[PDB]
């Protein structure tokens, strides 16, 4: 198990790698055997689209009394948690783990 | 059937299905005899308010009632009825003596 936390995965998800082709500049008309060094300048975007499927694992518990769920604040605050503020900016208010629910031993 | 062999086993417990909850209960009951096998008229003879007057009539029966939330779902049966679902209705019962 990876110590910061995670899957360990002998095969992991490869890794994908992407750069702007060169595109050079204008070269001398006379032939030198040097490498070109004048490029234009240019950059890319684009979209970029990741589709992960999850296998759950349903709790089948028979513990009597509720479990410590996670939940949000339902008090007045001046901003939502896990939103945006008002210059736009979203923001992250504490780590959520995952160990609520409970099992036995 | 007979008298050494039971006429029934213990069921209570809750299936949720995927759009289903079977939640089954049982309780067990004591029956007295009531006002001595007797039908008796009652009111408010005995000096009531104008408000408060009643005429009726008390049986010898008794009645088994299962009206509650609580009688069908345990604390985390309702939990899981109240965090997950946006409404609920009864679809069938069965009841045993």
């Given at each position: 198990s990876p110590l910061m936390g995670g899957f360990g995965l002998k095969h992991p998800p490869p890794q994908i790698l992407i750069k702007n082709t060169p595109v050079p500049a204008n070269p001398s008309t006379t032939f030198s055997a040097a490498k070109f060094?004048?490029?234009?300048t240019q950059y890319s975007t684009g979209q970029v689209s990741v589709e992960i499927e999850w296998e759950l694992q349903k709790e089948n518990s028979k513990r009597w009394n509720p479990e410590i769920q996670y939940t949000s604040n339902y008090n007045k605050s001046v901003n939502v948690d896990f939103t945006v503020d008002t210059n736009g900016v979203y923001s992250e208010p504490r780590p959520i783990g995952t160990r609520y629910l409970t099992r036995n031993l | 059937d007979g008298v050494g062999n039971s006429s029934g086993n213990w069921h209570c417990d809750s299936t949720w299905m995927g759009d289903r909850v079977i939640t089954t209960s049982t309780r067990t009951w004591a029956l007295p005899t009531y006002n001595n096998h007797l039908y008796k008229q009652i009111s408010s003879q005995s000096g009531a308010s104008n408000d408060n007057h009643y005429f009726g009539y008390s049986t010898p029966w008794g009645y088994f009632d299962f009206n509650r939330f609580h009688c069908h779902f345990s604390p985390r049966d309702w939990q899981r009825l109240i965090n997950n679902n946006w409404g609920f209705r009864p679809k069938r019962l069965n009841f045993k003596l």
């Open positions: 060094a004048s490029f234009i | -």
